Design a protein around this nucleic acid. Structure first.
Length: 486
RNA sequence: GUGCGCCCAGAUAGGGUGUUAAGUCAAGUAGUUUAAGGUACUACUCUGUAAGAUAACACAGAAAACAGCCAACCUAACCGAAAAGCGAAAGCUGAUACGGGAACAGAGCACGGUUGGAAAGCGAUGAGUUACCUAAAGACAAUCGGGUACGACUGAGUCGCAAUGUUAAUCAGAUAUAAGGUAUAAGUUGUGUUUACUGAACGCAAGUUUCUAAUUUCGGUUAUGUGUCGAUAGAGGAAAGUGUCUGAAACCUCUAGUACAAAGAAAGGUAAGUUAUGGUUGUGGACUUAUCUGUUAUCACCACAUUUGUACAAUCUGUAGGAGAACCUAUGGGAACGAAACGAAAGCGAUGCCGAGAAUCUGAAUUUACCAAGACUUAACACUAACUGGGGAUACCCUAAACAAGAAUGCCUAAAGGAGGAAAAAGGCUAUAGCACUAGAGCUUGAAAAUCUUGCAAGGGUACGGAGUACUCGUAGUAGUCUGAGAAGGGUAACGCCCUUUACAUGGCAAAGGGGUACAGUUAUUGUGUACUAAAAUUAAAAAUUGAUUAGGGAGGAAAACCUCAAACCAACAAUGGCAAUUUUAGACAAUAACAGAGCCGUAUACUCCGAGAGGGGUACGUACGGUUCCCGAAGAGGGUGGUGCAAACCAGUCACAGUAAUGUGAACAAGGCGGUACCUCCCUACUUCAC
RNA sequence: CACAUCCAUAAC
């Protein structure tokens, strides 16, 4: 099993208490050891962790490596590292994985002790964010609507954790709170096994086939720990700056950073000097365009997707700070898949998209319901409500045009209703496509309901056509409903 | 596998286009010239003149024959099923009855013939089931108070617009390579639109098209619409403009929806460009310009919707730059300062092609000036088609014929007489238990009527959609001095293409589909070279050595500062070194199996639509020929064959008993034959759809 | 500042 790590972080040769911290962690310290015995030990399965859903398959424990685990094995486990990066549809945050390997999943149970030992009470919010919660999007809508009296903002340029890696600092920082000063040598012997293969002398990391889920877990600890020594200058900087204008905050992410409470430009000279010496000494990487060239102030630039306001667009400002969606994130992902075409002439129009005749009938609508449902997790709160209504005009006609193009105009008619709507009535008689008219968290979720909500099953949020349902049963005995996901 | 769809001949079986000799009908009604001609002229009737109701009077216009859109209706063509025939069935063929009936594509084979004057759509909505404010601060009283075009919805009534295309002429010439719009392409991949390419045939070549565009209330606000906040214009402003009650001198509706001046400044319709645009043509509906005659008199009064010009400031309006949200320079509301989409695309230019009101003018013209195909019929000539008429190879399925190969007979008395004396297996003729195999059994019978595999003879259906070459069968006869050129070739063009010369006969297209034998080129399975040479980066980078350098243990359990038990090893920051791989610099390789079609340019030759023309977009890349990159298709369901389980049933001594034999029989998933089901697939084939 | 959304028929 994994009983070797349990006898390392508990003792730690505290005398002289090591770990982090050592002034406000005494009663809440043994609470982690109680969980690391019946939960992440684990059973051990069989039923533990796996790539398929969550529950793994059956093994001989597990199957033979866990039998002889205290005697290293393997030594030193090569496993090459190849270039791999997964791009998401929203929020430019590279979350790569790795080559699926049964040995890779055995390390996930060992790194959880490191994460739980820092998450309380030091590390806050797993995967970016600032305030500690239980999700990922709960710290991107409430924190931005708090402070912000001196307006302005700071964007980002390069990354600073994935590209230029100091290698030694990445390992030389975690051992300061886990590795013991005396009798400690079975920790960092398996972290240097991920030697990258790209005709260059480097090691860790650029993949990572050695650890798919292990990469996002260690990337947040290396970036948050280095900011602890920086707090001595940011807390002493917001003295006369917030009280200069009134009367009439440093949120971190994955690759970019923002700086709130500024003013004036004479005080911003220390931003490109105090923060530059910390990166050149620790991270050892030259900054790009001085980082990040203050535009001062309001300008439709590109930054993640939440343009902090300090047609289409709509300039809305006042006393508090809100969020306005910019137009740079909607002019890239659309043209790469040929969803809408600008000019041409007129303005915005769908068609078709590609291809004309493909798949069947249920597989076409599922693609549109899989790309529009995830927008609520990101663009679920925005002051520019009129912009979300214009974007729905390019999706209500694009999903239906692909269906009518499969049957062309040499067959019969189609059966549909009104999805505006409620509904569901109105049976139009058409052959081709078209006939007539086919704050807090918050209210932006209703925008997705006006598109395709239920026609007319009402079960989860998707809807198809009356000429594509499969006759089946539930197990008001039966009802002609859809059957694809459940 | 989009009905037919290939190649080579022709000219009403059934039909179309173009060029002529001719005939017939029509011009609202007369006259003149004149003619079975014709919108010119004169008189007259009627209609349009609402570019703002109507009258008087000048211009544009009056029919008919066709093409073509549609509704209601006979039957032949096509089909799931008739009937009647055929090796009695693998399948084909409709003089009929019952059924969609311009057949679902008419755009290259017409369906035809009457009546009727109208249908789908796009704007206006008649009837029903039914949703929200109320001019006043709110609620209630369904008090038709006020309704019910902001309608949702069931389902369609009644009016405009698809409901006319064509309907030709008083002459000629000049500004005529005029003012500027179709050609001169597809497709693949480099990507900051950089000039990237093969067997590009076209270049030069940089930033183009286009929108945020009008400010003393399109102020804070979309391509549309509704509602309410602030600056001001405050008449109403708790006994409500139906009925009643209860709180603030402050918030709702409405109103100065530009300070103003000058010329159009209202409902429709017609004739040309943009709008409907995603990859294109085109039939419909909304906005600009222009048009929808002169003149007299009751008829023009009016708050608006816009353009141009002028003045000023705010709503914190753009770029560079600057700056305490309540600001600060230049510029003046994109003054090329940003951004997105565009990947030899926009502009420009050479060459080539085309000629509309005959822009603008010179001679006009003259018995009121002089024009010969709009439509139908008939005759003749040139030319063409997926139509008609000839022609039937390579692979499968099924059946007939006591043709044949792979097998001929069961007992008793005891080799012979005898089952020619008695009867039962085996075969065959019915019903039927049963999934099949096997029949129980009367009779026939003790070699007979199709048990199977397969050959010969013969027949039906289908492969009658282009992939790079070289060919074997049906073949140089049915179109043979051709439309792919015969021999040599002149020039140009990528191959085609054009011109000239020319053998009177197996010179040439040697008429298509579909296979096989070798080989570029791709997908998939398996297999294979794994220093043929030097060098660079090195993947394995784990090991020994390169260090006299910092901190290091190897089973488990338990609070923080630790407490109990059993009892030297090793790592990193890195270097060198041969060994096996790849890339760069330099002198991956086989076998086997299958092969598909979205286009584009141009010659020759057939239809439809748009435009006055160059042409483009479709019709199987339109059907051939030639060139040519891009690009290696799928699902479902039968007829065969092969591999591999479970369950159930029957029949012979397959096992046992009685018995002359056949049979009976507890007992066959201790299975001999055989089949259903489950069932991953191989192979073959338009079996039926989809990708065009 | 807030809520609801408008373009068909036909030919591959």
């Amino acid at each position: 099993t994994m009983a070797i790590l349990e006898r390392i972080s508990k003792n730690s040769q505290e005398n002289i208490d090591e770990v982090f911290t050592r002034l406000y962690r005494y009663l809440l310290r043994p609470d982690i050891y109680y969980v690391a015995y019946q939960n992440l030990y684990s059973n051990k399965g069989a039923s533990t962790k796996g790539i398929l859903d969550d529950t793994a398959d059956g093994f001989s424990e597990e199957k033979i490596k866990k039998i002889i685990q205290s005697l290293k094995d393997g030594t030193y486990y090569p496993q090459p590292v190849r270039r791999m990066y997964i791009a998401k549809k929203n929020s430019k945050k590279m979350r790569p994985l790795g080559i699926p390997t049964f040995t890779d999943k055995l390390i996930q149970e060992a790194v959880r002790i490191i994460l739980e030992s820092i998450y309380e009470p030091v590390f806050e919010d797993v995967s970016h964010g600032f305030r500690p919660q239980r999700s990922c999007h709960t710290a991107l809508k409430t924190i931005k609507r708090e402070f912000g009296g001196a307006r302005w903002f700071v964007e980002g340029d390069i990354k600073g954790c994935f590209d230029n890696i100091d290698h030694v600092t990445l390992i030389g920082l975690i051992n300061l709170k886990i590795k013991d000063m005396k009798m400690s040598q079975l920790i960092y012997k398996f972290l240097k096994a991920g030697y990258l293969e790209n005709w260059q002398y480097h090691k860790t990391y650029s993949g990572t086939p050695q650890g798919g889920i292990l990469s996002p877990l260690l990337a947040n600890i290396y970036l948050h720990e280095l900011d602890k020594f920086v707090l001595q200058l940011k807390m002493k900087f917001d003295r006369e700056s917030p009280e200069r204008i009134t009367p009439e905050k440093y949120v971190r992410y994955a690759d970019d950073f923002i700086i709130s409470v500024k003013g004036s430009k004479e005080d911003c000279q220390w931003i490109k000097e105090q923060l530059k010496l910390f990166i050149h000494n620790k991270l050892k990487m030259e900054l790009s365009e001085e980082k990040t060239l203050i535009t001062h102030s309001s300008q439709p630039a590109r930054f993640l997707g939440y343009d902090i306001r300090v047609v289409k667009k709509r300039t809305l400002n006042g006393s508090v700070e809100l969020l306005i969606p910019l137009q740079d994130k909607i002019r890239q992902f659309i043209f790469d898949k040929k969803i809408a075409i600008q000019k041409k002439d007129s303005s915005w129009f769908p068609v078709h998209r590609k291809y004309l005749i493909r798949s069947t009938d249920l597989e076409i609508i599922t693609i549109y319901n899989s790309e529009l449902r995830g927008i609520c997790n990101y663009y679920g709160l925005a002051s520019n409500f009129n912009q979300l209504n214009y974007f729905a005009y390019l999706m209500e006609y694009s999903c239906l045009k692909t269906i009518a193009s499969k049957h062309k105009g040499t067959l019969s008619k189609t059966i549909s209703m009104f999805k505006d709507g409620s509904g569901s009535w109105g049976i139009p008689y058409e052959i081709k496509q078209g006939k007539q008219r086919r704050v807090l968290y918050g209210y932006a979720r209703n925008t997705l309901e006006n598109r395709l909500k239920a026609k007319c099953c009402e079960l989860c949020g998707t809807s198809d056509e009356n000429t594509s349902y499969e006759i089946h049963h539930v197990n008001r005995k039966t009802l002609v409903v859809c059957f694809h996901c459940h």
